[PDB]
Design a protein around this ligand. Sequence first.
Ligand SMILES: *C/C=C1/C(=C/c2[nH]c(/C=C3[NH+]=C(/C=C4\NC(=O)C(C=C)=C4C)C(C)=C\3CCC(=O)O)c(CCC(=O)O)c2C)NC(=O)[C@H]1C
Ligand SMILES: *C/C=C1/C(=C/c2[nH]c(/C=C3[NH+]=C(/C=C4\NC(=O)C(C=C)=C4C)C(C)=C\3CCC(=O)O)c(CCC(=O)O)c2C)NC(=O)[C@H]1C
Lengths: 492, 485
Amino acid sequence: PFFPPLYLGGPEITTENCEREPIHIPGSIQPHGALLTADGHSGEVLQMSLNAATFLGQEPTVLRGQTLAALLPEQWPALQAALPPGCPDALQYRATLDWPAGHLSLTVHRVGELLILEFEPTETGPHALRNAMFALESAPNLRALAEVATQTVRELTGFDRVMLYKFAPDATGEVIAEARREGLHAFLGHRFPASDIPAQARALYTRHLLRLTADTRAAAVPLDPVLNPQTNAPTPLGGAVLRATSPMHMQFLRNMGVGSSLSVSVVVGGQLWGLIACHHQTPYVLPPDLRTTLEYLGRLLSLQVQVKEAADVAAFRQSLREHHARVALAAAHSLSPHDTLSDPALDLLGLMRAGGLILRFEGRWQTLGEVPPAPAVDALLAWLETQPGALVQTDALGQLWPAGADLAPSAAGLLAISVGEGWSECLVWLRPELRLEVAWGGATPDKDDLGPRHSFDTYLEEKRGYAEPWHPGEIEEAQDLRDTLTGALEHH
Amino acid sequence: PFFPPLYLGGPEITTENCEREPIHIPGSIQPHGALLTADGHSGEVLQMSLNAATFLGQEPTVLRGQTLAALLPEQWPALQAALPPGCPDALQYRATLDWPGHLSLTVHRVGELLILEFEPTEAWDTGPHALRNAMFALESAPNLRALAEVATQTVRELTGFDRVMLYKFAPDATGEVIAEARREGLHAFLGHRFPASDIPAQARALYTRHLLRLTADTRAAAVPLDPVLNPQTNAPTPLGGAVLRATSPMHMQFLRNMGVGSSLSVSVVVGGQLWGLIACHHQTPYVLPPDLRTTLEYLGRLLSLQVQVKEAADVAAFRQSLREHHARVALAAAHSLSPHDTLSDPALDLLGLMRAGGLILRFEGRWQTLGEVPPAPAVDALLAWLETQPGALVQTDALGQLWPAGADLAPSAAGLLAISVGEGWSECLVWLRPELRLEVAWKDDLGPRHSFDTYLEEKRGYAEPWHPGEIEEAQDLRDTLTGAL
Ligand SMILES: *C/C=C1/C(=C/c2[nH]c(/C=C3[NH+]=C(/C=C4\NC(=O)C(C=C)=C4C)C(C)=C\3CCC(=O)O)c(CCC(=O)O)c2C)NC(=O)[C@H]1C
Ligand SMILES: *C/C=C1/C(=C/c2[nH]c(/C=C3[NH+]=C(/C=C4\NC(=O)C(C=C)=C4C)C(C)=C\3CCC(=O)O)c(CCC(=O)O)c2C)NC(=O)[C@H]1C
């Protein structure tokens, strides 16, 4: 439930209520350009940023109450045809102007009744985009795609760091690829919690696929009037590039020594899959024509992420079928159940990429790899008889079974299947608690306050007693092997 | 099973064996540019188009047996890094050169061999903002039709082609022109459908790998390679991934018979599947500049993503309509006065649920019709036949095939979708569709006029096919109306 903005007597945005900041209506822009609002039908100029006087080269009460028909004689008709009334706010029309001051870049979009116009100053790799397109397409897998992405974006822009975040099923982030300036601390591997990108921001980033912060310490430029004359309501700048960045996030960037930010959304199936995220250590305004190149990549990558990721998962379960069949080969020609499955040539640990494994057959049990102590295994198998059905699954049995909280370091994660119905005979794969070393290692990005160092520690805190989650393809192949090994007791 | 090419004593490519033409190895290029092949490791020039002497500005035995290290001193290292040995043939590296004029080098690797394409260009750009605005337009279009309109309109505005169509391949591999933009005073192709034959499987498969090919002049002479065979292996040079590949002579005739001077087409690919083509025709010869073709390639991929999204969201809203309709039937079904009266009620419109021409309602030992249905005795034989079938549901685009005795009934009922209310076909609903018929989109030999007639011939006794969402909702309604007894 949104708060009111600061300019309508809204509360202070603290770290404990930030998920309710109305980031879409700051009533102000960034000072590297200028903004006008105008009536959708009449073209009468209604609002204006204070600095618009100086960019456009006219006086502050001469622009207000003037027609766009007069101000943009060539563009006003084409502008209008490009944005029919009732079209969505995502739709944008661009063109370049030739004015005294100099060359400007007009970027227009319609929010219902209102037209919003953004003015920036304008005016080099000729085949860098085309070659990058073919490179992304001919990359072998998601990692290699992610490498080409971050590398290409860095070559085009000359940013100090270019990362690619991938959002996990639980909304937490992970830096899956990186390209950076020599002598900067790495973020590759860093994960951050869902909190650090509020749902309001996620949702906004799914609609509009680009936003920047050109100077993390610049003063915002208010609109005048701040409220829309049409409705006496705040102006929705969510789809304007020049929107003032949230003051909360601006601090976060400043605490990393980030002068400038930029990020392109990667969207697959109406879902925010990730972000190309760019940081510079000094203020840096990308020229409008170059930002367009990043936008093309944003969409080329959106298509290609989907294709490479789906083809990776095809080849993943393909490996699990061959492995599964190789288990079932030895299972039919079985000397002793325990001996055949404990055989390291088969590698039942490697099928489910497990740290440990409990094998239970003919009234007794054996382990393989890292497993909890003797008595714990008996209580664990006792607990398995409590559960209904053939399959049991969890990323943290500490939650699902309270008495097994102590067993997390050996076995936080669990995947189990009963061979006969009833848990007398069963396989039980176990995974260790999730632990990752810090992404920078030696260096520091900050320290105890708001920042990435805090964000990493507080991510690991959220994953207390949590294991690496089971791939759905592993849970499916577990349940196929459950049915196969039932057929291997036709020898018993 | 491919034939040998014409230059290795291959047979004549007729209209009856064209599905076996080795279109990937014509051993020749189009005369608006030039081609070199070179060794992947050494960079030694092996083959060369006869016209390459002219374009590059050197003599025909001076270029052959020269290194790319010498010829392209700046590019040869970068070229090589961009195309690692064993990388796929789809991967392309481009750069512009500055020679005695400006040339556009386009390189790709086919295993051991490097293939280099030279076309004339300029030193600028991809825009101005026509591409960017078109991207946002495609994205903010409401459905597949509206997307297809923006596509063909935008491509025509950028290129200035005479016609720009969008083909959509059907499940059976036949084509359909779903959208068009053209010059005022040209005959429309919107609605035209063509059979699977007219784009051979070899060409389909090639168009899935490489997403662009042209024919700059439909009556120009091809330019052979010298030598035609590769010195490495004494094997033909695979030009499948080269833009300058000579177009099949068979298709070139087809275009000429339409009065088409120039052709161009971009592949639309969704999930490793050739979904359709942006297809462009000009009535005079027309060479697209390399920089502009790149703009079409970007759209080809933007459209590939967006086709998928709009089409999946259309189908979401389609079955969404069928749920509301289904529930509105089940509302009247529970408060039923007489089964026949309630379902024959035009306020419910059981015809409109499955978009049917006719409907047979069978309840309490008797039957009634609705809309266009075959004669009285035919309906009795049809319901007799339904008792033969196992299960609750029966489905077909042409019952003439599935039931031989109902061949005569096609004009009223070629297509059939049927469901039994109780188990056993005593009580049942039977939707019926007419035979598929379409008017001409706008002589006797090869051409689109022949292709349209021969498409309709293939769809003899065939109806419009049932959407899977209609067959699914049919089977849900089957279970709902069992509950109304
Ligand atoms: C209490 C609110 C939180 C929050 C506010 C906030 N954050 C954003 C946008 C981003 N926040 C991000 C988080 C990180 N960025 C990083 O680089 C790292 C570590 C390496 C983290 C953890 C990111 C990535 C973004 C996207 C943009 C970018 O990369 O620069 C917003 C939205 C602002 C807007 O759209 O104008 C808001 C309101 N940040 C917090 O830490 C918590 C406190
Ligand atoms: C059995 C041989 C036939 C055949 C050979 C053939 N055709 C192509 C390429 C295309 N053929 C197309 C068919 C049509 N294009 C149209 O515009 C229309 C009518 C509106 C039809 C029916 C199309 C669309 C293409 C794609 C390229 C383009 O649009 O120009 C090839 C492959 C070309 C190459 O790369 O070498 C071949 C071998 N054409 C026939 O009619 C049958 C007899």
